[PDB]
Design a protein around this ligand. Structure first.
Ligand SMILES: *[C@@H]1O[C@H](CO)[C@@H](O)[C@H](O)[C@H]1NC(C)=O
Ligand SMILES: [Cl-]
Lengths: 95, 92
């Protein structure tokens, strides 16, 4: 059935939301290597602000460590614990 | 550290599966862009994640309509959501 307006609004608000991001882009300094999985889900600020002059931006972040399959010291396949920025709070702030 | 995601959780979060994504209303219904909506966007379930093999793409294998109320008075707009996904050979 139909989603009511309150539910629709709550689903479009500026808040942290999961987003799939390429791991290489989160760690550009780890060059000449591949990551498995090559993508991760990170909590990032997302949604719509009620005004064209506002953007949905983080007001609180956190670092989280994820174990991925990447490269070892020899460039072989090996596990890597890497750190990622997640957003914990967000706000509609002027540009 | 209490905030450490392990191998399995990492793999699970990478899956080709339906994921919530924010979509602007004006780029879904291009027949009503002469109007602003409150809210100006919606969350739709859409397929994403990444496949084991670069020659495959994460595509929807099941699709359903969802209706939502939005302020113009109040209007019902219909959207397509993805309920199932699969990695399929890339289309040429
Ligand atoms: C994450 O840790 C780094 C230390 O390198 C720090 O600079 C950053 O502010 C931390 N994030 C928060 C807000 O916890
Ligand atoms: Cl793709």
């Amino acid at each position: 059935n139909t989603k009511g307006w309150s539910e629709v609004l709550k689903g479009s608000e500026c808040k942290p939301r999961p987003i799939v991001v390429p791991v290489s882009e989160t760690h550009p300094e780890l060059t000449s290597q591949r990551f498995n999985p090559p993508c991760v889900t990170l909590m990032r600020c997302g949604g719509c602000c009620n005004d064209e002059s506002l953007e949905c931006v983080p007001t609180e972040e956190v670092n989280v460590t994820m174990e991925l399959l990447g490269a070892s010291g020899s460039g072989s396949n090996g596990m890597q614990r890497l750190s990622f920025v997640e957003h914990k709070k967000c706000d509609c702030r002027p540009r």
